[PDB]
Write an enzyme that holds these catalytic residues in place. Structure first.
Site, PDB file in Angstrom:
ATOM      1  N   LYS A 161      20.466  48.180  56.610  1.00  0.00           N
ATOM      2  CA  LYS A 161      21.157  47.006  57.123  1.00  0.00           C
ATOM      3  C   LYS A 161      20.858  46.852  58.605  1.00  0.00           C
ATOM      4  O   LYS A 161      20.740  47.843  59.323  1.00  0.00           O
ATOM      5  CB  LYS A 161      22.671  47.108  56.906  1.00  0.00           C
ATOM      6  N   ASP A 185      19.639  37.270  55.937  1.00  0.00           N
ATOM      7  CA  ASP A 185      21.078  37.416  55.740  1.00  0.00           C
ATOM      8  C   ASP A 185      21.814  36.269  56.428  1.00  0.00           C
ATOM      9  O   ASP A 185      21.222  35.214  56.676  1.00  0.00           O
ATOM     10  CB  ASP A 185      21.571  38.770  56.250  1.00  0.00           C
ATOM     11  N   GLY A 207      32.501  27.194  43.867  1.00  0.00           N
ATOM     12  CA  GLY A 207      31.604  27.176  45.009  1.00  0.00           C
ATOM     13  C   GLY A 207      30.296  26.484  44.676  1.00  0.00           C
ATOM     14  O   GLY A 207      29.779  26.605  43.559  1.00  0.00           O
ATOM     15  N   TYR A 208      29.710  25.812  45.665  1.00  0.00           N
ATOM     16  CA  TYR A 208      28.492  25.024  45.452  1.00  0.00           C
ATOM     17  C   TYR A 208      27.451  25.308  46.533  1.00  0.00           C
ATOM     18  O   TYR A 208      26.921  24.399  47.173  1.00  0.00           O
ATOM     19  CB  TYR A 208      28.802  23.534  45.391  1.00  0.00           C
ATOM     20  N   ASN A 239      23.978  28.003  47.683  1.00  0.00           N
ATOM     21  CA  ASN A 239      22.739  28.388  47.022  1.00  0.00           C
ATOM     22  C   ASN A 239      23.038  29.195  45.761  1.00  0.00           C
ATOM     23  O   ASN A 239      22.409  28.994  44.715  1.00  0.00           O
ATOM     24  CB  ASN A 239      21.845  29.170  47.985  1.00  0.00           C
ATOM     25  N   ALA A 240      24.006  30.114  45.840  1.00  0.00           N
ATOM     26  CA  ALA A 240      24.515  30.792  44.654  1.00  0.00           C
ATOM     27  C   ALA A 240      25.100  29.835  43.624  1.00  0.00           C
ATOM     28  O   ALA A 240      24.563  29.724  42.518  1.00  0.00           O
ATOM     29  CB  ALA A 240      25.592  31.812  45.036  1.00  0.00           C
ATOM     30  N   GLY A 241      26.188  29.147  43.970  1.00  0.00           N
ATOM     31  CA  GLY A 241      26.993  28.410  43.011  1.00  0.00           C
ATOM     32  C   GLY A 241      26.336  27.230  42.327  1.00  0.00           C
ATOM     33  O   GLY A 241      26.441  27.084  41.103  1.00  0.00           O
ATOM     34  N   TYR A 242      25.662  26.376  43.099  1.00  0.00           N
ATOM     35  CA  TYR A 242      25.010  25.214  42.506  1.00  0.00           C
ATOM     36  C   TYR A 242      23.927  25.637  41.528  1.00  0.00           C
ATOM     37  O   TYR A 242      23.826  25.092  40.423  1.00  0.00           O
ATOM     38  CB  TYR A 242      24.426  24.315  43.595  1.00  0.00           C
TER      39      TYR A 242
HETATM   40  N1  LIG Z   1      22.985  32.806  46.574  1.00  0.00           N
HETATM   41  C1  LIG Z   1      22.466  33.849  47.201  1.00  0.00           C
HETATM   42  O1  LIG Z   1      21.293  33.862  47.584  1.00  0.00           O
HETATM   43  C2  LIG Z   1      23.326  35.025  47.442  1.00  0.00           C
HETATM   44  C3  LIG Z   1      24.625  34.963  47.040  1.00  0.00           C
HETATM   45  N2  LIG Z   1      25.492  35.954  47.395  1.00  0.00           N
HETATM   46  C4  LIG Z   1      26.913  35.657  47.714  1.00  0.00           C
HETATM   47  O2  LIG Z   1      27.204  34.355  47.280  1.00  0.00           O
HETATM   48  C5  LIG Z   1      28.210  33.764  48.143  1.00  0.00           C
HETATM   49  C6  LIG Z   1      27.787  32.366  48.514  1.00  0.00           C
HETATM   50  O3  LIG Z   1      26.418  32.366  48.989  1.00  0.00           O
HETATM   51  P1  LIG Z   1      25.585  31.014  48.780  1.00  0.00           P
HETATM   52  O4  LIG Z   1      26.283  30.164  47.775  1.00  0.00           O
HETATM   53  O5  LIG Z   1      24.156  31.348  48.539  1.00  0.00           O
HETATM   54  O6  LIG Z   1      25.702  30.340  50.228  1.00  0.00           O
HETATM   55  P2  LIG Z   1      26.877  29.673  51.090  1.00  0.00           P
HETATM   56  O7  LIG Z   1      27.909  30.703  51.411  1.00  0.00           O
HETATM   57  O8  LIG Z   1      26.247  28.947  52.229  1.00  0.00           O
HETATM   58  O9  LIG Z   1      27.485  28.621  50.049  1.00  0.00           O
HETATM   59  C7  LIG Z   1      28.818  28.834  49.518  1.00  0.00           C
HETATM   60  C8  LIG Z   1      29.540  27.511  49.468  1.00  0.00           C
HETATM   61  O10 LIG Z   1      30.844  27.690  48.867  1.00  0.00           O
HETATM   62  C9  LIG Z   1      31.765  26.786  49.433  1.00  0.00           C
HETATM   63  N3  LIG Z   1      32.907  27.527  49.954  1.00  0.00           N
HETATM   64  C10 LIG Z   1      32.962  28.251  51.118  1.00  0.00           C
HETATM   65  N4  LIG Z   1      34.130  28.799  51.334  1.00  0.00           N
HETATM   66  C11 LIG Z   1      34.898  28.405  50.251  1.00  0.00           C
HETATM   67  C12 LIG Z   1      36.234  28.661  49.899  1.00  0.00           C
HETATM   68  N5  LIG Z   1      37.061  29.400  50.630  1.00  0.00           N
HETATM   69  N6  LIG Z   1      36.690  28.119  48.747  1.00  0.00           N
HETATM   70  C13 LIG Z   1      35.851  27.376  48.017  1.00  0.00           C
HETATM   71  N7  LIG Z   1      34.582  27.065  48.248  1.00  0.00           N
HETATM   72  C14 LIG Z   1      34.160  27.610  49.399  1.00  0.00           C
HETATM   73  C15 LIG Z   1      31.037  25.989  50.512  1.00  0.00           C
HETATM   74  O11 LIG Z   1      30.662  24.710  50.012  1.00  0.00           O
HETATM   75  P3  LIG Z   1      30.956  23.631  51.173  1.00  0.00           P
HETATM   76  O12 LIG Z   1      31.276  24.383  52.450  1.00  0.00           O
HETATM   77  O13 LIG Z   1      29.684  22.825  51.303  1.00  0.00           O
HETATM   78  O14 LIG Z   1      32.119  22.792  50.701  1.00  0.00           O
HETATM   79  C16 LIG Z   1      29.835  26.874  50.827  1.00  0.00           C
HETATM   80  O15 LIG Z   1      28.708  26.152  51.309  1.00  0.00           O
HETATM   81  C17 LIG Z   1      28.403  34.739  49.313  1.00  0.00           C
HETATM   82  O16 LIG Z   1      29.603  35.483  49.161  1.00  0.00           O
HETATM   83  C18 LIG Z   1      27.159  35.617  49.216  1.00  0.00           C
HETATM   84  O17 LIG Z   1      27.357  36.918  49.748  1.00  0.00           O
HETATM   85  C19 LIG Z   1      25.002  37.229  47.488  1.00  0.00           C
HETATM   86  C20 LIG Z   1      23.769  37.426  47.892  1.00  0.00           C
HETATM   87  C21 LIG Z   1      22.867  36.278  48.105  1.00  0.00           C
HETATM   88  O1  LIG Z   2      17.360  41.097  49.755  1.00  0.00           O
HETATM   89  C1  LIG Z   2      17.438  42.157  50.343  1.00  0.00           C
HETATM   90  O2  LIG Z   2      16.477  43.041  50.364  1.00  0.00           O
HETATM   91  C2  LIG Z   2      18.647  42.582  51.120  1.00  0.00           C
HETATM   92  C3  LIG Z   2      19.559  41.430  51.495  1.00  0.00           C
HETATM   93  C4  LIG Z   2      21.018  41.792  51.425  1.00  0.00           C
HETATM   94  O3  LIG Z   2      21.625  42.262  52.381  1.00  0.00           O
HETATM   95  C5  LIG Z   2      21.747  41.555  50.092  1.00  0.00           C
HETATM   96  O4  LIG Z   2      21.158  41.084  49.130  1.00  0.00           O
HETATM   97  O5  LIG Z   2      23.010  41.895  50.092  1.00  0.00           O
END
Ligand SMILES: NC(=O)C1=CN([C@@H]2O[C@H](COP(=O)(O)OP(=O)(O)OC[C@H]3O[C@@H](n4cnc5c(N)ncnc54)[C@H](OP(=O)(O)O)[C@@H]3O)[C@@H](O)[C@H]2O)C=CC1
Ligand SMILES: O=C(O)CCC(=O)C(=O)O
Ligand SMILES: [N+]
Length: 416
Positions: free
Chosen positions: A102, A142, A216-217, A219-222
């Site tokens: 990290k 990150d 949530g929407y 990169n993960a959620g959508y």
């Molecule tokens: N997708 C990935 O690549 C990865 C996903 N994860 C985990 O996924 C989670 C989200 O990441 P990702 O989706 O990629 O990126 P983001 O965190 O940028 O997107 C999450 C979205 O969820 C919404 N959100 C934020 N806070 C809240 C809340 N309290 N209640 C409801 N909706 C909320 C927001 O939509 P808006 O603000 O537009 O309304 C926000 O943009 C993190 O916890 C991350 O650690 C883990 C590793 C990587």
């Molecule tokens: O993708 C990786 O190698 C590490 C990124 C990271 O910190 C994670 O996925 O939690």
């Protein structure tokens, strides 16, 4: 509480479900190497500003350490250490030849121009160069950190290395032009979908038309919603964002929801859909609940209100231990976070493999390899959960720590 003490407490809680020696537990309780450096950059005005940077290598028994770099003004050494310890178990659970690492810089990137950001990225590499490398420590994107910064850091590392070895493999999450990997954008969602498929198969249910309420929407959620709708046979009935959320028993189209959210700043007030609170979406009659927005959305005061058969923890730790124990009683199958969202690190490993081999794969090969990896990891965790009669999170910890223990014993680092 202190994040590092929390991670150590989690490891100690996991330790009593397996036969691990005291010396090995004490070894795993502390990072093997911690590096803290000054990161000086010349600002646009002309002054020199010194930033604090971190690089923690928790354990490299199974291979070179892996972990992202977060640029946050609230970043602390304790958080970086906790996240490195977590990355150790993360890479161990999907059987990667990796250790846990990290990095981080205490900085607000919003007050930094593009040139200042590039200077910071290059200075961080010029400072931590002696403890990173394609076979030593492979960073990644990150929080407030992206493929552009990866390209800059890779270029700085290659300049220092003088193009002697494969410099593309020093860092992952790079752009496609310089050693980037296909399938990286959807890696976490794709892995989560694979784990959801395996969990439904374990529960012995068919997914043709089942309800899913993605929370949530991002990169993960959508992408989780889009892939659940696309190749899973599911039915998206509820999505939500920070501002609000929508619900439709008839069915929903994730793409039309996403473009509306982009053109209005939020999913809220999607036409033909009832706006509901995120709390109401958390407790909704569905088969799969996939929180992917923020951690600690499920607590003891609302754990009993969830009726989802499967809770896929796409987000990094959305369920608390109290809620964990409560939800295990109802019979709700839980997918631990570092198993559900391990697709990102698995595809990062694929990118590193392509970089060191100098040969790059297509989207289909990456998808198939990730499918097999996620399926094997989920089945290994679930069989441990059923065999030892323990919680899925505890079983995943047992698998990961057992792998790291075995590597440590085989190296001769510890005896018992
Ligand atoms: N997708 C990935 O690549 C990865 C996903 N994860 C985990 O996924 C989670 C989200 O990441 P990702 O989706 O990629 O990126 P983001 O965190 O940028 O997107 C999450 C979205 O969820 C919404 N959100 C934020 N806070 C809240 C809340 N309290 N209640 C409801 N909706 C909320 C927001 O939509 P808006 O603000 O537009 O309304 C926000 O943009 C993190 O916890 C991350 O650690 C883990 C590793 C990587
Ligand atoms: O993708 C990786 O190698 C590490 C990124 C990271 O910190 C994670 O996925 O939690
Ligand atoms: N990941």
């Amino acid at each position: 509480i202190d994040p590092f003490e929390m991670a150590v407490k989690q490891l100690e809680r996991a330790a009593q479900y397996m036969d691990i020696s005291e010396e090995a537990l004490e070894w795993l309780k502390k990072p093997m190497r911690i590096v803290e450096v000054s990161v000086p950059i010349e600002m646009d005005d002309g002054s020199v500003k010194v930033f604090t940077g971190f690089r923690v290598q928790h354990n490299w028994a199974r291979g070179p350490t892996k972990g992202g770099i977060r640029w946050h003004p609230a970043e602390t050494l304790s958080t970086v250490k906790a996240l490195a310890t977590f990355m150790t178990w993360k890479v161990a659970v999907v059987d990667l030849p990796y250790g846990g690492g990290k990095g981080g810089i205490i900085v607000n990137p919003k007050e930094l121009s593009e040139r200042e950001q590039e200077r910071l990225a290059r200075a961080y590499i010029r400072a931590v160069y002696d403890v990173i490398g394609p076979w030593t420590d492979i960073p990644a994107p990150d929080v407030y950190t992206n493929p552009k910064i990866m390209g800059w850091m890779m270029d700085e590392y290659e300049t220092i290395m003088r193009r002697k070895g494969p410099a593309f493999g020093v860092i992952t999450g790079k752009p496609l032009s310089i050693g980037g990997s296909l399938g990286r954008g959807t890696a976490t969602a794709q892995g989560a979908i694979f784990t959801i498929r395996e969990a439904a198969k374990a529960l012995g249910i068919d997914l043709k038309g089942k309800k899913i309420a993605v929370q949530g929407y991002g990169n993960a959620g959508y992408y989780t919603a889009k892939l659940a709708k696309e190749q899973l046979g599911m039915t998206v009935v509820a999505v939500s964002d920070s501002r609000g959320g929508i619900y439709n028993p008839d069915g929903l189209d994730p793409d039309e929801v996403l473009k509306w959210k982009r053109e209005h700043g939020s999913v809220k007030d999607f036409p033909g859909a009832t706006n509901i609170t995120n709390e109401e979406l958390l407790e909704l009659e569905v088969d799969v609940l996939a929180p992917a927005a923020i951690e600690e959305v499920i607590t003891e005061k609302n754990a009993d209100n969830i009726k989802a058969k499967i809770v896929a923890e796409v987000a990094n730790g959305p369920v608390t231990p109290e809620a964990d124990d409560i939800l295990r009683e109802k019979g709700i199958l839980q997918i631990p976070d570092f198993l559900c969202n391990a697709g990102g690190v698995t595809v990062s490993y694929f990118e590193w493999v392509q970089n060191i081999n100098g040969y790059y794969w297509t989207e289909e090969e990456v998808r198939e390899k990730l499918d097999k990896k996620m399926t094997k990891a989920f089945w290994e965790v679930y069989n441990t959960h059923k065999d030892k009669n323990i919680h899925m999170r505890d079983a995943a910890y047992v698998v990961a720590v057992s792998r790291v223990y075995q590597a440590m014993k085989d190296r001769g680092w510890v005896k018992k």
